[PDB]
């Protein structure tokens, strides 16, 4: 009778809603804001801690902290504030009545899973709970049981091979640059035009500039040559105090850090050949359909032209005796939530819940034997 809840806890953007929906009901950033000045107009609703999109609204007078960094929960009390804001203010439901599905990053440590279980059953008192993985729900939302998933959000980029509906832990590879580092690099390369963005309040402005005006160049050098010669790609943005900035060759230079990590001084590999390094670690027989199923998921896959560039870069260094196709659904920024919403609403999922009494005579250790 009751309806399950799906809550995908991103490192920079948390999604929540009810199972059986085609879209998440609530998308809001996972930030906790604290005031940096003194509230002299007393009795006019000042709070010690502003949580979520409200903290995005009055972001000038606050300092912002992210409770999840690099996909892993580090600050736990702020994560309780995120979950309290999610249940009580945002979705407006009592957690005692609704089962809750959560998603975790691949290669999550066990202690974070146990602590997630403990604050889920003690503090909020859910009647049922389950934990799932980002990439397998992305692959289920794509309608596949075998494929590579490039899940690149705000904290990390994960390459996860999945064969027969289960991941391969020996070939899951983690590359630690995402849209946070792209935002920081864009704050770096807007300094030569004379614009300065230093504090965490206007990092969100640079993130909005990155979302509205960026694209992946198919070839970099001729794009730089045409940017240097002409001015057909220089466009303007309106800052929310009224000043207008203009951006030229930085529109396409900022996505290129994914393909060239040396732009930020990172000595690791670009996003195209780390998928090759993951797929060489798999068995020789299963590479045929694994090359054919290139699932892109996450918000930093939403640049225009990233799929064609990824097709070119895989096709360059894979052998010519096979076909490469890149798939990119339009809903790939919500695809983990879509896979969770399909998973929670099935007729075989009611026995896969972790009920309250099983946690009572099992403690916070039954989450390993059931979420597996």
């Amino acid at each position: 009778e009751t309806t399950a809840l799906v809550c995908d806890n991103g490192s920079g953007l948390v999604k929540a809603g009810f199972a059986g929906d085609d879209a998440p009901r609530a998308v809001f950033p996972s930030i906790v804001g604290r005031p940096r000045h003194q509230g002299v107009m007393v009795g006019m609703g000042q709070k010690d801690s502003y949580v979520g999109d409200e903290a995005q609204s009055k972001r000038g007078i606050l300092t912002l902290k992210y409770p999840i960094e690099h996909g892993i929960i580090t600050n736990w009390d702020d994560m309780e504030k995120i979950w309290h804001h999610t249940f009580y203010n945002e979705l407006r439901v009592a957690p005692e009545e609704h089962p809750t599905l959560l998603t975790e990053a691949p290669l999550n440590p066990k202690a974070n899973r146990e602590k997630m279980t403990q604050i889920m059953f003690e503090t909020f008192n859910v009647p049922a709970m389950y934990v799932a993985i980002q990439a397998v729900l992305s692959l289920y939302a794509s309608g596949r049981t075998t494929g590579i998933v490039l899940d690149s959000g705000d904290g990390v980029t994960h390459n996860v091979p999945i064969y027969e509906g289960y991941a391969l832990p020996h070939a899951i590879m983690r590359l630690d640059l995402a849209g946070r580092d792209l935002t920081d690099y864009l704050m770096k390369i807007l300094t030569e035009r004379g614009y300065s963005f230093v504090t965490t309040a206007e990092r969100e402005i640079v993130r909005d500039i990155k979302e509205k005006l960026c694209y992946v160049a198919l070839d970099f050098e001729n794009e730089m040559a045409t940017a240097a010669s002409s001015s057909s790609l220089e466009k303007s943005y309106e800052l929310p105090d009224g000043q207008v900035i203009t951006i030229g060759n930085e529109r396409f230079r900022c996505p290129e850090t994914l393909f060239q990590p040396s732009f930020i001084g990172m000595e690791s590999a670009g996003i195209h050949e780390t998928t090759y390094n993951s797929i060489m670690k798999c068995d020789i027989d299963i590479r045929k359909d694994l090359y054919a199923n290139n699932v892109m998921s996450g918000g930093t896959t939403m640049y225009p032209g990233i799929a064609d560039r990824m097709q070119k870069e895989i096709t360059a260094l894979a052998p010519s005796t096979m076909k490469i196709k890149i798939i990119a659904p339009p809903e790939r920024k919500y695809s983990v939530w879509i896979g969770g919403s399909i998973l929670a609403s099935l007729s075989t999922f009611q026995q896969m819940w972790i009920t309250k009494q099983e946690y009572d005579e099992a403690g916070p250790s039954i989450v390993h034997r059931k979420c597996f």
């Binding site: 692959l139 049981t145 399909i342 059931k370």
Partner: protein, 144 residues
């Protein structure tokens, strides 16, 4: 590899034959016998063939078939039900993905008469929502 105890899975893969299931609103219903070999273009299907060997063991083969008009929930449910039916078995089955119009030749080999497609199908289990939508038009008088 946690097993599931769905009550319709108990009649799956016990005798050599060929079994078809249709997805209707996050659940499997077996289509009747004289509706075999033909499919709706807007639904998702789970196909099982089990084959007896000479040495006594009984092999399995899963396919999951997606039309060109099926929704996201039907195809996702077909993939997850394929995975869970493999996990109900002892991992002895191989899975295949079948797309309408681009089927494998071995998938054409299973049906004697051939493949024929009709329009329509069962409706999706999803209900449409938009993220962060409010449609509000109110007026309040504060007084005192």
């Amino acid at each position: 590899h946690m097993v599931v105890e769905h009550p319709e899975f108990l009649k799956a893969g016990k005798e050599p034959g060929l079994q078809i299931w249709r997805v209707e609103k996050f659940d499997l219903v077996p289509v009747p016998t004289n509706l075999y070999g033909d499919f709706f273009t807007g639904d998702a299907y789970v196909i099982l063939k089990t084959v007896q060997l000479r040495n006594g063991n009984l092999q399995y083969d899963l396919h999951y078939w997606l039309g060109n008009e099926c929704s996201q929930d039907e195809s996702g449910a077909a993939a997850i039900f394929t995975v869970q039916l493999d996990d109900y078995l002892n991992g002895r089955a191989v899975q295949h993905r079948e797309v309408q119009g681009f089927e494998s030749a071995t998938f054409l080999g299973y049906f004697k008469s051939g493949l024929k497609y009709k329009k329509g199908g069962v409706a999706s289990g999803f209900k449409h929502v938009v993220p962060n939508e409010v449609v509000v038009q109110r007026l309040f008088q504060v007084k005192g």
